[model samples]
Target: GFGCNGXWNEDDLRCHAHCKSIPXYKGGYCAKXGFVCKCY
Candidate 1:
């Protein structure tokens, strides 16, 4: 299903997974809408 405007996936989400949890995880929960996971 559609979520986080395309910031989340089945494995995780930007709102909490790689965005809210870690500071380096740049998926966008406080910032814009991009990640630094390399594959994200």
Candidate 2:
């Protein structure tokens, strides 16, 4: 889920990278399902 293909782990950095690439990037965090990218 969330473009991540694996178990829930420390994917915060991964999410952060993705979010930063986006135009609406605000923040990001790793969740049970996957990375949660925050947007504004």
Candidate 3:
């Protein structure tokens, strides 16, 4: 019952919109203010 934990995971790089938990993690336009997970 954990296959629906949003589109991100712990292994994935998280992003933030305001807060910066990790180094290099910057703010942009994320609904969350923890990590700015941006990938392509």
Candidate 4:
């Protein structure tokens, strides 16, 4: 799928597994996490 303006098996983004979801989760988390989607 042409997502995030990138090609398959390449640059396919996803919610940062390292994404921390807590009260301190600043910047909507995503800011530090990622696109917060299966595909950024």
Off by over 4 Å in 3: 1-4, 7-19, 28-40
lDDT per residue for candidate 3 within 1-40, as digits (tens), equals 1112243542232333222554564533333322334422
Clashes of each: 1, 0, 8, 0
Number of the top TM-score candidate: 2
TM-score between candidate 1 and the true structure = 0.18
lDDT by residue (1-40, candidate 1, tens digit) is 2123433443334344545455655453322243333212
Please give the TM-score that candidate 2 achieves against the real structure.
0.48
Give me candidate 4's TM-score against the actual structure. Answer: 0.14
Q: Record all residue pairs in model 4 with backbone atoms less than 3 Å apart, i.e. clashing.
A: none
Model 1: how far residue 20 lies from native, Å: 2.9
List per-prediction Cα lDDT, in the order shown. 0.37, 0.57, 0.33, 0.27
lDDT of 4 at 36: 30
Off by over 4 Å in 1: 1-11, 14-16, 28-40
Arranged by TM-score, best first: 2, 3, 1, 4
TM-score of each: 0.18, 0.48, 0.22, 0.14
Residue 6 of candidate 3: its Cα lDDT? 43
